[PDB]
A paper describes a structure:
Nylon hydrolase (NylC) is one of the three enzymes responsible for the endo-type degradation of the by-products of nylon-6 manufacture (cyclic and linear oligomers of 6-aminohexanoate (Ahx) with a degree of polymerization greater than three) and various aliphatic nylons (e.g., nylon-6 and nylon-66). However, the post-translational autocleavage of the nascent polypeptide between Asn266 and Thr267 generates an active enzyme with an α subunit (27 kDa) and a β subunit (9 kDa). Based on the X-ray-crystallographic structure of NylCA, we reported that four αβ heterodimers (molecules A-D) form a doughnut-shaped quaternary structure. In addition, we proposed that the nucleophilic N-terminal residue Thr267 in the β subunit functions as a catalytic residue for either autocleavage (from precursor to active enzyme) or substrate hydrolysis.
In contrast, the MAV of wild-type NylCp2 was 85,602 based on sedimentation equilibrium analysis. For example, in wild-type NylCp2 (Asp122, Tm = 52.9 °C), the distance between position 112 (monomer A) and position 122 (monomer D) at Cα (designated as “a1”) was 7.04 Å. In contrast, the distance between position 122 (monomer A) and position 112 (monomer D) (designated as “a2”) was considerably greater with a value of 8.43 Å. In contrast, NylCp2 existed at the monomer/dimer/trimer equilibrium in aqueous solution (2.1 S, 2.7 S, and 3.5 S). Thus, it was likely that the partial asymmetry at the A/D interface disrupted tetramer formation (reaction 2) but generated an irregular trimeric structure in aqueous solution by reaction 3 or by successive reactions (reaction 2 followed by reaction 8), although the enzyme was identified to be a tetramer by the crystallographic analysis described above. In wild-type NylCp2, Lys159-NH3+ (located on helix α2 in molecule A) was 2.87 Å away from Glu115-Oε1− (located on helix α1 in molecule D). However, in NylCp2, the amino acid residue at position 122 was replaced with Asp, and the close proximity of the acidic residue Asp122 (close to Glu115) reduced this stabilization effect. However, the structures of loop 1 and loop 3 containing His130 in NylCp2 were not built during X-ray-crystallographic analysis due to the poor electron density. Moreover, the temperature factors (index of thermal motion in a crystallographic structure) of loop regions 1–3 in NylCp2 were significantly larger than those of the corresponding regions in the thermostable NylC-G122Y130 mutant.
Numbering used by the authors:
A (entry chain A): 19 to 128, 136 to 259, 267 to 355
B (entry chain B): 3 to 12, 15 to 28, 31 to 91, 93 to 129, 132 to 133, 135 to 260, 267 to 355
Write the structure that this text describes.
Amino acid sequence: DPAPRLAGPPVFGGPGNDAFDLAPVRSTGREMLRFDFPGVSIGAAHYEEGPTGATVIHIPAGARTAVDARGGAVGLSGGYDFNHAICLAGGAGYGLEAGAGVSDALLERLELQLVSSAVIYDFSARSTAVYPDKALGRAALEFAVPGEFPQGRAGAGMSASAGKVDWDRTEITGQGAAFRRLGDVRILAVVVPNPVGVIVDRAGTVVRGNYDAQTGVRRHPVFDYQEAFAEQVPTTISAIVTNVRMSPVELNQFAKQVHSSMHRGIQPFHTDMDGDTLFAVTTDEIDLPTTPGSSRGRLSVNATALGAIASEVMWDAVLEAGK
Amino acid sequence: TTPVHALTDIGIAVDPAPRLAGPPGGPGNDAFDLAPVRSTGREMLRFDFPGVSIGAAHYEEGPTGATVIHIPAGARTAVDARGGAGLSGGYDFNHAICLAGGAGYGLEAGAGVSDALLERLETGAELQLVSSAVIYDFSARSTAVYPDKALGRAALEFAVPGEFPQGRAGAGMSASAGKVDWDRTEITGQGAAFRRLGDVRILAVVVPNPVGVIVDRAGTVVRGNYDAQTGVRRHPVFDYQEAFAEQVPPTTISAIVTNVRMSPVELNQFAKQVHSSMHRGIQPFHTDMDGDTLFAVTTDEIDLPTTPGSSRGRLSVNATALGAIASEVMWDAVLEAGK
Ligand SMILES: [Cl-]
Ligand SMILES: [Cl-]
Ligand SMILES: [Cl-]
Ligand SMILES: [Cl-]
Ligand SMILES: [Cl-]
């Protein structure tokens, strides 16, 4: 039963990028997750003037990627099946410019450097028109370090929010990550939930979004929706990074499986008002065995198994963003 | 002057002279003080389509460029993206479409457009929506300069109603065709064409950077796969079949804009029909090495009649008919790019 973080009403018409001399800030969030995943670095930067920001996953060697993009409001750039970086940002479609800043910083750091970017609309959660721009994307890349992720209000999660049946009940989320290692297998989940729905934990409790100040209690949106019909008639952007070799077909199905699994932690999900986008990335370092047997079952070591495990890592990340 | 049966019976005079791109690790944008140039190409197409403006700008230092179609009202859009080998937005409603060189780096030009549009609006949908697509034009020149935010802003600022610069202009500056071997690749250009039939308006814009070659309605290869040893261009299939017998022994970005109202389903099918029709003028097309992308846009100004009949047949006035007509406009635009 966490304390509320109501976004409150936006005032539109606020100052935009041209009104400020905008200084990138390295985002530290509420706490740092530390993880051991060689070849994967994360940077996050924000403008306090927004507040809004960008988070970048940099895999310098390049990595095979599948994109699973769902619903009616997707704002995506690049979308390559091979990337050196994934950039997530606020600022709606304007924030895609941060990915150009990353592409720039990748050149300066130096044949094509490939960056895929996705965004959330975060303007209703604040009272300015500031967006992540080329300078902020460059900063995020420059700030990237191995094995750290800033949880909470950091990078793209600065002004992310959940539970949009009515904006009077919408709460600020954050960004979240989680990491697991099993033998040599490594899985990192990164998520920026800006859902129309709410964040739900494994017991079914609504933990962020749709908080009613009149009652002090969060509701699952379906209870509002059903009563609304009875009376009247008559986006999340995310990445899963692993080191297990998967074919293009396996990686694409893995992406779909993990992305669907997020309707456990975010409800509703994949709605017409969401543009949910998941990047599944593999560093292609570890082979799955040629046969899928173990003591735990004849069909227990395969890409479906990896998908189920990664789905748990992603639910933990979603809960970190909502914490 | 002759009975009209085939398309060839009714043209664009393509220059037979070669324009070989020639063989290509050179300087990038910050090596230069880059000033956008308004692109005028080899000639200006003039057309009457209020609400639609086109601007084109280039950097001579590339040479590379961007071409922007601005529809300030916003327009419903279908994207048909068809191959292997860089898109931004791909929204189902757009205030602008930005086509650029520079491979994926040139998607930055669309951000320049988006930012300029946001500034004119002094973030509620007051969101300005720009979809961008790119071609890889780096093999056709010796620098790494790409269309950036400033160049996209400049293309938008240079946009005028009712004009389009044909040839080596905007995104077409360093486009090229015919890539069985780079020794036979020729520079293309960008091209546009426009038809008004009754109240119906159709504008085609294309930037062909194909693996394949540009082909006219008679079947003659007119740009790409020019063999300097023979002085002629042949269809790539002759090279491919000879290659197989020997060794295995016993992107185009485009937009089609119309004023006719179509539902989301009709528009998406219209996009697929027109895009496929381009395998007539570009061959091969939709290959694994191409990332072909077409934007089909309607300004939703006029309705088709409720019934599809006419003196020319029971099923003659419908979106399929519109797609067939628009396909010819697009082939003309392809030929203008190769001229
Ligand atoms: Cl929102
Ligand atoms: Cl839980
Ligand atoms: Cl090329
Ligand atoms: Cl600029
Ligand atoms: Cl012809």
